[model samples]
Target chain A: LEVIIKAKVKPTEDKYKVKKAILNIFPKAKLTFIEKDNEFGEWEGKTKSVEKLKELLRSQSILDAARMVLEATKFYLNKQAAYVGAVNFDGGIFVKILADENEDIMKIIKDIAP
Target chain B: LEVIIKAKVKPTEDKYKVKKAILNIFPKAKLTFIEKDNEFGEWEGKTKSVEKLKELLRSQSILDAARMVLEKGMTENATKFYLNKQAAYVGAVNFDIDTHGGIFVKILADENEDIMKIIKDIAPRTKGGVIIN
Candidate 1:
């Protein structure tokens, strides 16, 4: 069974590299990229190989960052964002969310200060 | 085959209620709950029975208004969803559980289900649906 996922290319992230790696696994996959619209730099792909599918799910190079917090779907990566809270389905769903680093503050002062 | 996950119960969310539901399904799941000095409520549990495991997944009680947002991607059809890289997203589609196009739910089963399938096949619909206030 194959699953299809759509995601945006992170800033400065390679869209084709993501496709090329996944394609190496699922060569017959139908994945696409888009630009110049409300939704730009998206990779919409489909593949039956679970290993290849998780590569995208785990990396989320194509997925947005903020939604990982707002949405509670937590990994099924398929159904609605339920089963995380009260349902708390067994073997419960969890996410290793991405966060912004604060080291930029030091570099900013070093560059702009006298 | 089974899968184990640890999750945080968000603000104002209950812990026992969650445990009860899964217990009702698995009746023998080794679910654990822990309190932290700097974090929200957390629980780690393992899923065994696929048939009953789905009962927990399909149950609407797990859905609520607290976790509200758009999916990581677009479309309401489950089959058409996995193709998108944001396939990890979970939210209302076909408008189930009173989501006015809201209550985004999310889950990732690719790796976990790989182990889960060995015992009882995880089925086509590995992910759950949505709701929330």
Candidate 2:
């Protein structure tokens, strides 16, 4: 199975630290931090799985940092949720999906975006 | 396949409308509203087939609201969503896997006209906080 996670840091926030934290898990993740239509610089990544995610996420430092960053990030939509958005560094926030290896992963996304 | 959706409406919001909104799609969806703790209500439902869902969600209104519920319901479960009418809430109980693919349905109306179709004569209808697109 494959998974993708994307998060953004505050203006001039050291996203490198966040990236390093992620590399702590997905050693080979492909990450790109660029400015979207908004001013804040964001990082989007791909390359997957969940358990390795759970193990690395058990990190207090990593969880704290991710929770902090979620607040200031830009939005592609209207509002942001507190519990769901705040501690998304692998805690509290929902871990969505259980797909068989056969499903078309991209199809799920098309409906979400549209 | 079966899926369950639940939500708490704003204080002044009509719980019935939300339930009806959902029934519009999953005609047989079992919905419940609880306010003993908070002034909100919720609905739970289950059913799936990616193609069927896509066709059901041709409407934007249901598509949008289903977003949060789907994200919430599908959380913490394996990629192979547990969609069985006998087991609405994914619990550690008698279970079976009918399909191998995983799906989070914030959309689909159970191939039923439901209340919405009868009333309006027509049809309708995440991830974590940091959803992966």
Candidate 3:
């Protein structure tokens, strides 16, 4: 399994805080912060494991929501919720889960969702 | 001088970040977060001095504009105005209007205290970009 996450760090936001918010949800993510020539910055990360995210989904009782995201092959998270270490369907974090064509994507979904 | 600082914490904003923006300008402010029964929350703070803001005004050479705002916004017991939160986050001052969704700041004076005097002390008239005592 491969997961990629990205978010914009607005001028009004602190870069480190945005990083913390991302890590709060995807603890295993290897991240990078790129400062742009303009006012905005960005966070890019990749992870192979969603174990921590799964735990949070179960605890937060957002399994159905998580399932929908997984089924759709991508998801977004609420930046504020992630900063506080919770999962929410809202702005600010974009997550994409991918697998090889030969791989059982449905099985992967059931494994994560169920 | 008594100053009250307040800003709405939108669902997408981190409350602590909002507080940081306020403290960036008013470091001595005592802050509180009141969570509403609805989606929006608030950051409310109070401080007695504007020493930090004065320094920024001089350093950024926005004293003249600040003076204009302080004068135009002045009232009997307060100089109330809005500040752009984005600018305040980075230690800059950008005066704003109510519709811009920025921080609401109100500096108050005691009934016996002269609000105009306080305004002068904060952002005095300038001559050729220099503060006129």
Q: For each prediction, how big is the interface RMSD?
A: 15.5, 17.4, 5.2
Rank by TM-score, highest first: 3, 1, 2
Q: What tens-digit string does per-residue lDDT give for candidate 1 at A17-36? A: 43443354345567877773
lDDT (Cα) of model 3: 0.82
Query: Which regions in candidate 2 have their CA more than 4 angstroms from the true location?
Result: A37-39, A54-114, B1-133
Instruction: Give the poorly placed runs of model 3, Cα more than 4 Å off.
Output: A1-9, A13-34, A37-39, A42-114, B97-100
Give per-model TM-scores.
0.26, 0.26, 0.59
Error of 1 at B102 (Å): 15
Task: State which candidate, 1 or 3, has the greater TM-score.
Answer: 3
True contacts kept of each: 0.00, 0.00, 0.22
Between candidates 1 and 2, the TM-score winner: 1
lDDT accuracy of residue B73 in candidate 3: 84
Which candidate would rank higher by TM-score, 2 or 3?
3
* DockQ of candidate 2 (2 decimals): 0.02
Q: What is candidate 3's lDDT per residue for A41-104, written digit by digit as tens? A: 8899999998988888899888887787677277788887787788888547899888767787
- For candidate 1, the chain B TM-score comes to 0.39
**B99: Cα error in model 1, Å:** 12
